[PDB]
Design a protein around this ligand. Structure first.
Ligand code: JRY
Ligand code: JRY
Lengths: 306, 306
């Protein structure tokens, strides 16, 4: 029993983190086989960051301009290239700790673990779900650029996120490991800001099923609703539309609990209209939307507790 | 910026987790140097669990009754002994991945990371703070016994918790690594239940300082209060008393933010008396008490954002 915001065990990723220094800038890199991946803005001065042409900045560098430190060992840089917003530093040694891995791009509403790192040294691990507006609500301090986000699927690490910057609302923006930004953000100094966000409805429904599996049942009701009438209330409260594919995805949780998806939808409508009246669900006084149906199934493989 | 419930990177602990099987029971063990530590209830049948005499049960076992599997390698058990509620299995191989470590007992109100494991395989990592009533609100399914809780101090792992059982309210009870239970709980089947709990006041104040460091300021006020008058309101809302040592501990956060501890106390009193009026703090609609002052300082080393 119990329900926690749980991250994947981080060891496989810790064994890949290195420190990359160029000039007076230090940030983190990801060392897989004989390549080190990091944000290309490592090659920028502050004046550069104002309006950089990275192809120009990079042609003025050589391999020896990049100091890579893996723990207590300096790695010899033997090639460099740019792929979109990431720099690829070819090094003369393959990382003996490389896990099985893939570079996957995730969708808004999906979750991943973040290994926050400073100076190539891991400092903490937490779960973060990509927001509909393609930002993440992370916890990052100066120096954390290059920290990565990932899921682990069996023994395979799917990297999905590399951290690049903080937007003015305090939320975070970055790229996939192909260097393509999530969202309409750029690695240069502009007035760029997060667009409007919405709540991830399928996740909120998943979390209500988690609550039922864990014995919180006060919000259930006898009512049902139709998909269209539900989505009419969703729109009003800045919730994403629920689709038939979402309903299908919630199938297993519905079956385990014996609560139809559209019945749980009627509970959610009531919660949106009435609030909680001083009660909590799984320790929260707000409706939580950063657990996907898969996250709930993985963590709640336990008894439904009728 | 940002504030997340962050766990310590788990690799150093992942490298110590093994599977311990006795009879038809499998649970997790912790392999440090040439010893494997696990819950002694691994030696119990269900009928045994009803009312066991563990000294009797253990004298009837031999080394070959214990199968230890470290990944794909069976470890040869060459000695066994009991220390309080933990079993110590001496094995013929020292774990080459043993970190620098210590066995520390923590205090109620302190936090730690949990590496939830099944069949010797790590499945997730999350942050859990020992409650005043010596339970933890974890996320554990059958098979998770033997999973450990820990802090990491530089490269040294301080183990503080081994998981043993779930109480009827769905909260979790266990021991330090010396096998001494936290709280008035026993590793046998009884009607045992969690005693009444309270909120960890110093942690709530720490988290309010985190909120200020992160730009949530709506709950601040011009008022102050005295320590005694504050503790008079605390008692009424099931909050622990605040001590002068707690105030001293909050010193650095008070200095960074320029908000006196007793002024922040007046904000907390107002929040307790009035609620939040539909607003949130650091993404929560409840006052959070599972971050210690040290956790806030470690994660918020960042700009105060005046
Ligand atoms: C990373 O450690 N800091 C981010 C500073 C650079 C942002 C400009 C794109
Ligand atoms: C651990 O995996 N399960 C706990 C079952 C035994 C509890 C009796 C003390």
């Amino acid at each position: 029993s119990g329900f926690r915001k749980m991250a994947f065990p981080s060891g496989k990723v810790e064994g890949c983190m290195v420190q990359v220094t160029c000039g007076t800038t230090t940030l983190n890199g990801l060392w897989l086989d004989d390549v080190v991946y990091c944000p290309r803005h490592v090659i920028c001065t502050s004046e550069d960051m104002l309006n950089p042409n990275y192809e120009d900045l990079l042609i003025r560098k050589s391999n020896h301009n990049f100091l890579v430190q893996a723990g207590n060992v300096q790695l010899r840089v033997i090639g460099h290239s740019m792929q979109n917003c990431v720099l690829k530093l070819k090094v003369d040694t393959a990382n003996p700790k490389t896990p099985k891995y893939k570079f996957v791009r995730i969708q808004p509403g999906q979750t991943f673990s973040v290994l926050a790192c400073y100076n190539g040294s891991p400092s903490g691990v937490y779960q973060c779900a990509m927001r509909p507006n393609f930002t993440i609500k992370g916890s990052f301090l100066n120096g954390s650029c290059g920290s990565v986000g990932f899921n682990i699927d069996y023994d395979c690490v799917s990297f999905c996120y590399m951290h690049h910057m903080e937007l003015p609302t305090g939320v975070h923006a970055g790229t996939d490991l192909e260097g393509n930004f999530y969202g309409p953000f750029v690695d240069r100094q502009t007035a760029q800001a997060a667009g409007t966000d919405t709540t991830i409805t399928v996740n909120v429904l998943a979390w209500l099923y988690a609550a039922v599996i864990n014995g919180d049942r006060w919000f259930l009701n006898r009512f049902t609703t139709t998909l269209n009438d539900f989505n009419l209330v969703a729109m009003k409260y800045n919730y994403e539309p629920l689709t038939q594919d979402h309903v299908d995805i919630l199938g297993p949780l519905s079956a385990q609990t014996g609560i139809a998806v559209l019945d749980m939808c009627a509970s959610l409508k009531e919660l949106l209209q009435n609030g909680m009246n001083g009660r909590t669900i799984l320790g929260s006084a707000l409706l939580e939307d950063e657990f996907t149906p898969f996250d709930v199934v993985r963590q709640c493989s336990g008894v439904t507790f009728q």
